[PDB]
Design a protein around this ligand. Structure first.
Ligand SMILES: CC(C)=CCC/C(C)=C/CC/C(C)=C/[C@@H]1[C@@H](COP(=O)(O)OP(=O)(O)O)[C@]1(C)CC/C=C(\C)CCC=C(C)C
Ligand SMILES: [Mg+2]
Ligand SMILES: [Mg+2]
Length: 284
């Protein structure tokens, strides 16, 4: 029951706490891959949460320097500046897998940027943001969840990450609005004649529903194209990745069934998640 085990179990704790869908899915991987996913998760979570620690970029620059120490000196003992437990585990993972460190740097730049948030002019900017926050995560995970990483593998993984993020945005419209974030593009908002503030005030309508469903068709189409290439991923990871996706896809029906409410976070019941997994296991 070693010190390293304790490091991973802490990372596990962070993921079960914060990520109900992805926890449920990725914990079903073999031990060595699921532990690698916990570690990558906890690093990404620290990066995403780092600003509201003091109020400024301090903890974030520490995280980055810790990651750069590992990249540069993967086998030396580091006195980590941010979170020792998470960084020891990432270092362990890096000694065994070809981590794309530039994908973590991309994620971190995206977090820096989001301080001076400004709304996206076009869907092209929005999709670029999706890459920064979530495509990158797919990239980091690639060597973990596939046997032989090629460009096709990274591509599928990126596309998956980016559509899960688009689903995320689609679940959290109202919550995001309260935090003075709107993610739909000004182009697409103007086109559908939608003022998010107005809809947060007055309830949904046919305009907002149409704009919401525009982006949903994009996420679902991207989901289907990923599923068609599921076989880039190792045989053990295939069903797990399919479940993670299906669960997050189900969030879209949850939004619908709640009439596109901007005043709560909808969710897929645990008992539903198990149903989807049952469904997926028959196939496999
Ligand atoms: C490392 C791992 C599993 C996740 C990343 C953990 C973090 C925190 C990243 C910081 C930026 C953020 C917040 C991104 C959003 C994750 C959901 O937020 P979370 O808060 O956990 O859950 P929920 O909002 O539902 O409560 C997201 C949608 C990206 C999901 C992308 C995946 C999974 C790659 C798919 C490709 C393959 C599997 C090849
Ligand atoms: Mg969360
Ligand atoms: Mg969100």
């Amino acid at each position: 029951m070693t010190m390293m085990d304790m490091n991973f179990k802490y990372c596990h704790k962070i993921m079960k706490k914060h990520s109900k869908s992805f926890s449920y899915a990725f914990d079903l991987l073999p031990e060595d891959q699921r532990k690698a996913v916990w570690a990558i998760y906890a690093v990404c979570r620290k990066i995403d949460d780092s600003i509201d620690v003091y109020g400024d970029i301090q903890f974030l620059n520490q995280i980055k320097e810790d990651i750069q120490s590992i990249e540069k000196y993967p086998y030396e003992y580091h006195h980590f500046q941010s979170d020792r437990r998470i960084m020891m585990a990432l270092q362990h993972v890096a000694q065994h897998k070809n981590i794309a460190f530039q994908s973590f740097y991309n994620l971190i730049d995206t977090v820096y940027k989001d301080q001076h948030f400004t709304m996206f002019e076009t869907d092209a900017e929005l999709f670029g943001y999706c890459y920064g926050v979530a495509g990158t995560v797919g990239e980091v995970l690639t060597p973990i969840l596939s046997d032989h990483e090629t460009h096709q593998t990274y591509d599928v993984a990126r596309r998956l990450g980016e559509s899960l993020q688009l689903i995320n945005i689609l679940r959290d419209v109202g919550e995001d609005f309260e935090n003075e974030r709107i993610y739909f593009s000004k182009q697409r908002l103007k086109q559908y004649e939608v003022d998010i503030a107005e809809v947060y005030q007055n309830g949904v309508n046919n305009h907002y529903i149409d704009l919401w469903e525009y982006y949903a068709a994009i996420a679902e189409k991207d989901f289907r194209d990923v599923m068609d290439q599921i076989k880039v991923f190792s045989i053990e990871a295939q069903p797990i990745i399919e479940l993670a996706a299906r669960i997050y896809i189900e969030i879209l029906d949850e939004v619908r069934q709640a009439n596109y409410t901007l005043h709560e976070r909808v969710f897929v019941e645990k008992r539903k998640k198990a149903k989807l997994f049952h469904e997926i296991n028959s196939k496999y």
